[PDB]
């Protein structure tokens, strides 16, 4: 129904918020491909924010960047970053760059997504997808048929 | 509008409330299939699986779901999350913490504050509330007037 | 149900509206004193205490407070956080935040989703709200037809 | 009362709705200019603005706007910010969370549970609730029973 | 009364979580028992939830424990950790540990409680006792009376 | 109107906080004053708390303070604390204090303020401004002719 009260929510639990995939919305992935989508820049704060559910991934990423000197380029992981939890592939990357400044943010304002953890920056040494969340009502009757 | 909701049929017959029509989108740019983790929320299946410790920990932590594009709206779903991206952006760039952020406890509120922020009136477009025991119990005292 | 309450009589007289009645629960599993510490509310006391710098500090920061089984609320304040922690735990395995969780603000929250997430059935079981005062109305107004 | 609203006229007429006058507060001890700093929350000025790798970054994050003293609001809300300090650092004694706090959560559910916490009594003071469509529908009833 | 309306919440401040203690539920709490319901584990993340009133504890405990190379099994406490607020009698422990791995999660399910903070987990150095909380609808009238 | 339901939350974006200087409340602020309403104590839990708007600072400081074994005796800032965003005069102070313990307390209750936060103590290095908030609504209309 189109009205504003179409639709019930009982407990904040019944918010869920999906992540979905870039490679879900037939997007290449391939490491060299996927790479042209990151990007290093100063001045902007990482951010982060907590989802509920996310698609099985068809690939994930697992990167190391540092700065010619062995520092990272890329942010240590915070105690709430876990590796993405369901990776059919995922691709270690490990170098350095030679004239590359600030932290790693996506092009295209996608996430990067971790275990119900979405971001604005890569996570150095963290399992990660690239991806986009959306928020919907799903309560624990319709919850517990689709997962079991 | 409002947190669209995610229904069961009217196996597994599934119905999404979302439809970008409400946006140039037409045929499709996903997959059908959509297979899906979530934290197990069983009760006590193995009867001390709440517990910290007796739970299966970080590898077996979740459930595997699967959403059949009945409807269409498995691609809807990912045209959603596409859309919603940039007001998420937005949302994040005013926030100062970096850690985290409960987008689940924003929409909550979100939700009340649509259907509730305002003011009601009654039997109209954009609040909630049911008049047909309030009128049904209005014409039951016009009947107890007889004699 | 809903947070339970925890009311003033109808010294110092304490009701407590949860029954885990409503669960096999009889006798005494509990001690009746219930003694207990909260952080100083207190209303300018020493004028200036409101300020941090002026606050008594931690070792002073907290106000001691007393609990009698006067109904055996105590023993049921005691079960029910003996119940609450399964729910609990299965709360914050979702959770992926360690740091901290605000249960307070998602109490607050689910409370009133529970009384205004769906739509009202005027005068009905599970809705809030108050026709006494309309209904005196609706009166009031069929008296005014008099001449 | 409930979170003071800042409204525009009935350029930039602006009205606020906090008096302290609802507290001994009298003539002027604040600047009648407040030029003030907001993030930018442009919506695509630039196209892809959104994206945080081509937001402005740190430097060029603010937008700049003039609250000019039209009714002696500026000084009312310089006085406002005075005295919400007591009870903000009051409840920062509290909260255990050192890192960060969101007030603006905690505003948004306070002001739900005062319109809604309760139990409402139609037509009535504390309470939102409009009845004018309703009764002019129980009057569009009572001309139906004409012939 | 039994009714869903039955109750009122003016403002999130009336909104009490009060911890309670395992001794308060008969529970034998003497350091050799109250050990036997403590375990090391890997694979679980550490999660705390705050709270805004307690029991008076009888006993407490301020542990902390290695590994035989002296690196602590116990997590370092976050800065909102505080050590518990009224401890009747407290149980200094410092020791090490020859097998074990990961961190020390209650058995029962109960809570670690420290100062308005449960933990599912033992915090190194921080005086805790064990407990479970509970919430409910306090008005500050009837607060101010109980307290005062 | 002075009616508890006059005034519409349609979002919770149209929640404002605003940040006020004391300077703006026409409070000396010339380093050797401020600095008589700034004070060290232990025993008290810095907190901060976020905001969203803020006025323009006249003056702000970027002080850092230690202990004769240079030592700072200011807390190192959280990732969340950036200088405050819009100073005109900013006094940079470096120094020592002989005799003191603790942390930088505002003596009369007011908040140091930083780039969207607020804090009952002062972060070394950070640019801030005295100041106190405010809460109010605004929609996005009326926000939108303001800043533009
Ligand atoms: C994702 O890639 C990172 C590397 O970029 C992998 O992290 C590596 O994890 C192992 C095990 O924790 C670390 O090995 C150990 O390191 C310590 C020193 O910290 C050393 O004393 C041990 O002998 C051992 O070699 C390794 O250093 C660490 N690398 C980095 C750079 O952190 C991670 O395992 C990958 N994830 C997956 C799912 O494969
Ligand atoms: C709970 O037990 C812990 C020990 O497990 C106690 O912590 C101890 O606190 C004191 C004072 O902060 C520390 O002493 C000082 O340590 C520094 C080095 O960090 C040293 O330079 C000083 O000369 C002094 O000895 C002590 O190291 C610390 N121990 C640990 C392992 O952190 C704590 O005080 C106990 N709590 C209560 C309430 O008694
Ligand atoms: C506010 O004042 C602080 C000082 O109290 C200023 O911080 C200073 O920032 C610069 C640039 O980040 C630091 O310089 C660099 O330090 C590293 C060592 O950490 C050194 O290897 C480099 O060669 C360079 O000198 C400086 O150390 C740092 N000082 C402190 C104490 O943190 C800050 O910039 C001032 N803010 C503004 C807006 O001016
Ligand atoms: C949402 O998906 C669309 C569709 O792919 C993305 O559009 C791409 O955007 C990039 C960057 O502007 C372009 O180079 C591509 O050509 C676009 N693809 C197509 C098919 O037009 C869009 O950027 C995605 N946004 C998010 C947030 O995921
Ligand atoms: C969970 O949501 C579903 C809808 O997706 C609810 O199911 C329907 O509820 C209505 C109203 O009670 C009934 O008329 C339908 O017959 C229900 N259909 C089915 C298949 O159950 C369901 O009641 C909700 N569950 C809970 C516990 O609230
Ligand atoms: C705090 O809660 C108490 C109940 O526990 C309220 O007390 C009663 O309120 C009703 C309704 O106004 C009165 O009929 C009773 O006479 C009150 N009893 C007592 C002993 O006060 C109390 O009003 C609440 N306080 C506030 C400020 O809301
Ligand atoms: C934003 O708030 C303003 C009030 O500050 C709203 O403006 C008035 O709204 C009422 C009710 O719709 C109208 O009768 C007035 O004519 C409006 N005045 C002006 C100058 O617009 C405004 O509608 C709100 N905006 C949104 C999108 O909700
Ligand atoms: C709540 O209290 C009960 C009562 O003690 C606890 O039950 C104990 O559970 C352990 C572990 O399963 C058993 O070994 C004991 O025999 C049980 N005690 C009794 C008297 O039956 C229960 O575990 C507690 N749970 C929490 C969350 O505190
Ligand atoms: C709010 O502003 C008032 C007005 O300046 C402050 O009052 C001052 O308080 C200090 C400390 O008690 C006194 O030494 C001054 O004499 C007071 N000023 C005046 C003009 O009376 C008050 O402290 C401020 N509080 C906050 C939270 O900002």
Known sequence: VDSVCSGTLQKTEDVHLMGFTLSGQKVADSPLEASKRWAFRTGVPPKNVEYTEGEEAKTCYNISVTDPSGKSLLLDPPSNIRDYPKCKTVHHIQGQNPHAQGIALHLWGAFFLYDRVASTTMYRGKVFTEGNIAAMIVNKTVHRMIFS | ?147
Do not use: M
Not at chain 2, 95 to 115: G, M, W
């Open chain 2, 1 to 147: 509008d409002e947190s669209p909701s995610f229904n069961t049929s009217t196996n597994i017959s599934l119905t999404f409330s979302y439809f970008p029509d409400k946006s140039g989108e037409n045929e499709n740019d996903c997959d059908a299939e959509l297979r899906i983790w979530s934290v197990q929320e069983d009760d006590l299946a193995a009867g001390l699986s709440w517990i910290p410790f007796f739970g299966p920990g970080i590898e077996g932590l979740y459930t595997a779901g699967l959403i059949k594009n009945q409807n269409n709206l498995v691609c809807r779903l990912r045209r959603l999350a596409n859309q919603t991206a940039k007001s998420l952006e937005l949302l994040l760039r005013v926030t100062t913490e970096e850690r985290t952020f409960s987008l689940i406890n924003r929409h909550a509120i979100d939700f009340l504050l649509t259907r509730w922020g305002g003011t009601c009136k009654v039997l109209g477009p954009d609040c909630c509330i049911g008049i047909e025991d309030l009128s049904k119990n209005i014409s039951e005292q016009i009947d107890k007037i007889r004699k």
